[PDB]
């Protein structure tokens, strides 16, 4: 069905179309070519030849999202109808093309991957990610012509969405002095108010961990709004995770609410998942007391 | 019409091993619609492709594959350019120079049509002519592109490229119908380490020069991490090991071999574990042994756990109480095919950016394997902090910090063992939220383990330790490992009468409290 | 299968092609051949300028040289011999002519001693006996640079030299006086210089 | 042959690198082993490098050695320095192409090579000034045409500052350290330096 | 053998006489290779050459059997002033790693 070929190929340009075209055909002639290891032969097969669509599909986000998302509680579902709820904003209004919005929570709250899942669930044809991942050494004029490129690449849609991770380190903050780089934050501020060419839309999204720095900056009146992450807060959550995960058998299990159900906590599931790890790895029989031990040792300080 | 593939060509006399995906890939791609027959292409109406790239670390095989494709096929001889042979000081010389080399294809295109023969242009180290855009450079890169691929439709090249930096490369000469057919050509494994030690090793085998106690398998397998250059490399040597005994019954055995196991690049250091562990290792108390049992841990961990590929965890000491050399010795006990130390005194008059590089470096390069462990240490010597002020290198704490928590590419794991003195700094620094753990090395702390580690080292005799205990032990003490051997040697210099005097002086002199 | 690169003496071509070829008609375009040290050359003429008809008549050349669709060679006639670029065959002579080639060139971008202290390291060896100084074989001294702003001073030390040692009288060369309006012949002055050195040496020996 | 003082260091190369050309033809061609294809040399100005380079050259009847100073081989204007290091190579070539495996083996002795040769600059926009003449250099060296009938000397100052693919199996894979002398290699160097005046007899007794 | 690393510092007050001291004892000390690295041929200089120069004396020092060096005034290599104070890293950075690293093996 060509229809389906069509809506599957979204921002495909016509050399890209033409090359779809000539892999498949490469693809569904080579089945016939039997023996080029030996000696090159041809069948009396290649009468019968045909283009099928499992060759189309041959032809034809897990480096971020490395663990997934568990629905351990109800916040998971309030963020993920504010983020539906902005989304559709986005998409139906005409007075209003850009709009902002800021992800605030404690450390190691798992909010880059959060940010990710929406952008994903929008739907839109273009996302694009950026990341200190690829500006390593760079110096401060360098990092300016990379945002300018990302931002001005996404002016050529109908439909954009952005995504900036790890603002902290993007302007290589130090609470010492304190002492950062202030082209970065100047280009960034002069950045976020500047609306496309008529008719077209763009969203941002950002992630930080220190909401109190950014405060001190006079940054956070450039935002639309704010979504807060809460931490992991109770023994019967902490069950609810630990029996979604699938780890600790009901024995084990008993003993641990004997104990933390008598409790509050304060943890990022990051941590939670390296703590598993490392208490997996001793012998069968001393497991559930090194991760009580564990536990008891991470500390709260809410 | 003719043929394009010689009668006589088999797979098997190519002589390349190891690459069997990569060639089926290769040839599924770029040759499987110019030996189909033509009346059905006639009736598909499509182009053939036009250019394939090849790209990968040193010593994997991609000239050697160049020329192989070259010789496979029943075109004429290629035109060959060698690196940057073509450019030149006058204007317009060098784009005269790119437009000679398609002339006699535009001549049989127009001559003959669609009965014309095959040809094939190589380009060597093609990097240096083709950089992104933004004059002299720009002009030679926007000739080769019009000339490729112009107002004027042709039907009968295709054009193979060879780089070690691919990502310096123009975008514009990279997209489909154009150079689209991309491979890589990695470090092989051991089922291709024993295929190309077949390939490198069967006409002695024919004449029954090789010993029947050689065990091609036991060679498989002691030689990880190698590449195809150290395995012919290895053979060689061999081949020259054995002809030197006789300076016509010659024969090769295991003996030349071990005898002759080259440094790989990609491998493990020696000289590096004999210059960092210089007085090896003396059990004197419990904490070493903790210590140890620790890093096993750590170890176990990393090498069987699918859901945590990068771990993390600095260790700290009080000066002298010696962090490096525990840090190697675990290094060592990992037991993993890379290994390597990034240390400062390597970097002496460097700037910011030099250190940066040479730490992406080691980094990246690391990346390539499927274990590897890293050692960082002295990382307060690495910012280049003193207390006043204080004053740092703020460039170099961000490069770190991002570093910290990078993933390797999928299903690669590393280790990370870092190395400190002052903890307290490093605490104010933000630093210690991106390590996973934390272990303490302890100083020596009683007189018993003083006693323990004096007759382990065994310099002074029984009466003097007896004379040593009397005063040591009547209180605690304070002392690490370097200094007391640094005391140690100061004290063996004077005459025998005064010794036990002097030593006890000098512990005197040196407490200080915890 | 002939080519060589070594140059060679061209005006004696030209006067050659002005005596094999006197009275021909020549025209723009025409391809012949010519031989001279028994190798054989191809070519092609591309330019034709008259002489200005005063020249005829006996007068100075206003330099109006008509350029003509046909000439004739006459025992005055002049002929140029420009090269194909791709080529080795070096050439000279003086008049066989060489426009000068105004063509750009792109860049590449981017980027003492006390004059006694001198007889010691220059003098002390050629003042001995031959007997022992070839007994160890040491090494001379042959060339000294002087340096420094103009003035007479630098030629009065010279004449000092000349003086001081039992030397020949000098011979003094001022300038690129060996460059001759005879290329080739600016060589032969040199050749010239050191005919009466090897002689000498040729002669006396030691 | 007048150097003395480093006969470990030349018994170890005789022993790596040139056992195959004194070995008979055909046993070697039995084997099927390729020849060593250059060696580096590093150390103290002034400890008789030069002299060594020569001696090897003129043990296997080679012919008349290439020298040439690092410095000079770089140009002031464009494109020249890889025009002159390929010149180099056109003797061998030709006689190559002439006499199949027959023609005669070839000379190259670099100097103070570490000052053409360095790491090429991996980031982008921060690249090296003279990246083109070591990517000339590592295409002649070993590229699709194979030459058979030459080997390349290298002398150096800084290892640690010359390119890594300089240094791969397939180039240079040999490497040796010329370090100052001891008091027998005094003894030896007096000997052969004093020996003419010892043959004519000026050497005193009281010396 | 187990230590062949070993450091030490003179100190007093102004126009005591450490150099001539300093100097003494390297007379006395009779090994074969004696290096003297001060500031007073360095007049000039800026920092990296500074650091250049030290480098390049100490790669010197590696090659020879048995070595020692005298550094004479710290206090100017530094250039350190009172106000501030302000000083140039770069140099403390080459002496403090350099106060550590061994030679090679028995030397
Ligand atoms: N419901 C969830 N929400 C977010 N992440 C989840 C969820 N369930 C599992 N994860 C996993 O948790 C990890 C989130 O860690 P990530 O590296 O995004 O953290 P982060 O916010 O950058 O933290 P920090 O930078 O403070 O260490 C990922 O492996 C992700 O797949
Ligand atoms: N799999 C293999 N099979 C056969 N020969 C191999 C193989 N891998 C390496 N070689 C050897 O590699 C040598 C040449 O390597 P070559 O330089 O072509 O590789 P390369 O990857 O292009 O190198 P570089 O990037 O260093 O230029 C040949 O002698 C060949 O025998
Ligand atoms: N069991 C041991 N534990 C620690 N060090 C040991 C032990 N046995 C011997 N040593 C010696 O301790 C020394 C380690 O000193 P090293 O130079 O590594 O110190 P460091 O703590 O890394 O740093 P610094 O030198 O700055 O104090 C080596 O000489 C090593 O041989
Ligand atoms: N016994 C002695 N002790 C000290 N100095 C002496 C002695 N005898 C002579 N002198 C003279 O004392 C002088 C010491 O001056 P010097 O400049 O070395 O001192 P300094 O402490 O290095 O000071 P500065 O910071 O000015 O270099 C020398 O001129 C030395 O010859
Ligand atoms: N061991 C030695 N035997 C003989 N001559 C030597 C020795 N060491 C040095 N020389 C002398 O070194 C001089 C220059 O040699 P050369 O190799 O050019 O030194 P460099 O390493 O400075 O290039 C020669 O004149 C030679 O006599």
Not at chain 3, 114 to 128: N, Y
Request: hydrophobic share 40%; aromatic share 6%.
């Amino acid at each position: 069905d060509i229809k389906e070929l069509a809506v599957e190929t979204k921002n495909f340009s016509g050399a890209e179309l033409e090359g779809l075209v000539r892999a498949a055909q490469s693809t569904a002639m080579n089945r016939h070519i039997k023996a080029s290891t030996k000696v090159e032969v041809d069948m009396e097969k290649a009468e019968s030849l045909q283009v099928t669509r499992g060759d189309f599909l041959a032809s034809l986000y897990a480096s971020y999202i490395m663990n997934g998302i568990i629905k351990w509680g109800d916040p998971v579902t309030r963020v993920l109808d504010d983020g539906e709820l902005l989304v559709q904003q986005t998409k139906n209004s005409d007075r209003t093309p850009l709009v902002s919005v800021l992800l605030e929570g404690p450390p190691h709250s798992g909010k880059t991957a959060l940010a990710a899942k929406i952008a994903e669930e929008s739907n839109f044809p273009f996302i694009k990610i950026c990341s200190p991942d690829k500006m390593i050494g760079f110096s401060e004029t360098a990092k300016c012509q990379a945002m300018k490129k990302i931002f001005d690449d996404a002016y050529k849609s109908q439909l954009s969405c952005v995504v900036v991770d790890d603002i902290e380190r993007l302007l290589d903050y130090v609470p010492i002095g304190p002492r950062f780089s202030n082209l970065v934050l100047q280009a960034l501020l002069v950045l976020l108010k500047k609306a496309p060419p008529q008719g077209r839309k763009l969203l941002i999204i950002g992630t930080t961990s220190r909401k109190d720095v950014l405060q001190e900056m006079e940054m956070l009146n450039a935002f639309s709004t704010t979504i807060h992450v809460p931490n992991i807060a109770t023994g019967e959550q902490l069950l609810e995770a630990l029996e979604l995960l699938g780890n600790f058998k009901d024995k084990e299990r008993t003993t641990i609410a004997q104990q933390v159900k008598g409790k509050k906590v304060w943890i990022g599931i990051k941590k939670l998942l390296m703590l598993i790890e490392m208490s997996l790895q001793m012998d069968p029989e001393y497991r559930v007391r090194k991760f009580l031990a564990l536990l008891r040792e991470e500390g709260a300080s809410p | 019409r003719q043929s394009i593939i010689n009668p006589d060509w088999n797979f098997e006399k190519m002589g390349i091993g190891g690459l069997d995906k990569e060639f089926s890939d290769i040839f599924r791609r770029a040759f499987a619609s110019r030996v189909f027959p033509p009346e059905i292409v006639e009736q598909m109406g499509c182009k053939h492709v036009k250019g394939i790239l090849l790209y990968g670390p040193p010593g994997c095989g991609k000239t050697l594959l160049a020329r192989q494709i070259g010789k496979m096929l029943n075109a004429r001889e290629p035109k060959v350019v060698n690196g940057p042979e073509i450019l030149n000081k006058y204007v317009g010389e060098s784009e005269a120079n790119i437009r000679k080399l398609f002339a006699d294809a535009e001549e049989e295109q127009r001559r003959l049509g669609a009965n014309s023969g095959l040809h094939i242009i190589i380009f060597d180290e093609i990097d240096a002519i083709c950089k992104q855009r933004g004059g002299v450079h720009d002009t030679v890169v926007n000739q080769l592109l019009s000339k490729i691929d112009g107002v004027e439709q042709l039907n009968n090249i295709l054009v193979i490229g060879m780089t070690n930096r691919p990502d310096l490369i123009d975008e514009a000469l990279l997209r489909p119908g154009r150079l689209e057919v991309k491979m890589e050509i990695g470090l092989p494994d051991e089922k291709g380490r024993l295929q190309i030690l077949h390939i490198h090793t069967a006409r002695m085998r024919g004449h029954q020069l090789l010993s029947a106690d050689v065990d091609i398998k036991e060679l498989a397998v002691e030689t990880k991490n190698f590449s195809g250059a150290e395995l012919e490399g290895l053979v060689r040597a061999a081949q020259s090991t054995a002809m030197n005994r006789h300076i016509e019954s010659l024969q090769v055995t295991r003996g030349d071999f071990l005898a002759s196991l080259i440094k790989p690049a990609f491998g493990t250091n020696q000289e590096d574990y004999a210059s960092y562990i210089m007085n090896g290792i003396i059990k004197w108390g419990d904490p070493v042994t903790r210590v140890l049992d620790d890093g096993e841990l750590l170890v176990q961990q990393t090498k069987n756990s699918d859901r945590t590929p990068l771990v993390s965890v600095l260790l700290e000491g009080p000066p002298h109480s010696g962090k490096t050399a525990l840090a190697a010795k675990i290094a060592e006990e990992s037991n993993f095919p890379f290994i390597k130390i990034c240390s400062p005194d390597k970097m002496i008059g460097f700037s910011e950016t030099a250190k940066c590089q040479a730490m992406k470096k080691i980094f990246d390069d690391a990346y390539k394997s499927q274990l590897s462990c890293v050692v960082v240490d002295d990382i307060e010597r690495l910012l280049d902090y003193v207390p006043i002020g204080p004053r740092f290198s703020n460039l170099v704490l961000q490069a770190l910090l991002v570093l910290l928590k990078k993933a390797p590419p999928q299903g690669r794991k590393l280790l990370i063992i870092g190395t400190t003195s002052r903890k307290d700094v490093l605490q104010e620094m933000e630093m210690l939220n991106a390590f996973s753990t934390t272990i303490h090395v302890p100083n020596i702390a009683t007189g018993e383990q003083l006693l323990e580690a004096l007759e382990l080292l065994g310099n002074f005799k029984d009466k003097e330790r007896t004379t040593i205990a009397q005063q040591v032990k009547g209180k605690k003490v304070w002392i690490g490992i370097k200094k007391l051997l640094m005391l140690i040697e100061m004290s063996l210099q004077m005459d025998p009468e005064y010794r036990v005097r002097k030593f006890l002086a000098l512990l005197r002199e040196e407490g200080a409290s915890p | 299968k002939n080519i060589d690169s070594n140059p060679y003496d061209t005006d004696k071509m030209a006067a050659e092609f002005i005596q094999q070829f006197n009275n021909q008609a020549f025209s723009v375009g025409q391809q012949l051949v010519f031989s001279f040290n028994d190798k054989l050359f191809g070519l092609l003429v591309k330019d034709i300028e008259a002489m200005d008809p005063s020249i005829l008549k006996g007068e100075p050349a206003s330099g109006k040289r008509q350029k003509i669709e046909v000439g004739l060679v006459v025992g005055n006639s002049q002929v140029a011999f420009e090269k194909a670029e791709n080529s080795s065959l070096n050439l000279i002579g003086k008049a066989k002519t060489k426009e000068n080639r105004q063509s750009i060139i792109n860049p590449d971008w981017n980027f003492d001693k006390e004059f006694s202290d001198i007889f010691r390291r220059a003098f002390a060896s050629r003042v001995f006996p031959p007997e022992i100084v070839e007994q160890m074989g040491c090494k001379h001294v042959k060339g000294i640079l002087l340096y420094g702003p103009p003035g007479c001073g630098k030629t009065l030390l010279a004449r000092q030299i000349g003086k001081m040692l039992n030397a020949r009288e000098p011979k003094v060369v001022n300038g690129p006086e060996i460059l001759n309006k005879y290329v080739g012949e600016s060589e032969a002055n040199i050749r010239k210089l050191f005919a009466d050195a090897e002689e000498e040496q040729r002669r006396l020996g030691a | 042959m007048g150097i003395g003082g480093l006969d470990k260091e030349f018994s170890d190369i005789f022993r790596r690198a040139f056992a195959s050309r004194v070995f008979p033809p055909e046993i070697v061609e039995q084997m099927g082993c390729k020849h060593v294809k250059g060696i580096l040399l590093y150390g103290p100005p002034g400890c008789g490098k030069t002299l060594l380079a020569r001696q090897i050259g003129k043990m296997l009847n080679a012919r008349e050695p290439k020298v040439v100073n690092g410095p000079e081989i770089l140009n002031k204007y464009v494109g020249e320095s890889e025009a002159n290091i390929r010149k180099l190579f056109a003797d061998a070539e030709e006689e190559q192409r002439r006499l199949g495996a027959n023609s005669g083996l070839h000379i190259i002795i670099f100097d103070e090579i570490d000052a053409i040769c360095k790491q090429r600059g991996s980031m982008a926009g921060s690249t090296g000034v003279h990246d083109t003449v070591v990517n000339q250099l590592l295409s002649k060296i070993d590229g699709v045409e194979q030459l058979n009938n030459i080997l390349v000397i290298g002398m150096t100052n800084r290892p640690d500052l010359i390119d890594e693919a300089l240094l791969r199996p397939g180039r240079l894979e040999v490497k040796m350290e010329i370090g100052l002398p001891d008091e027998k290699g005094r003894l030896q160097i007096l000997h052969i330096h004093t020996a003419r005046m010892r043959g004519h007899q000026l050497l005193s007794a009281d010396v």
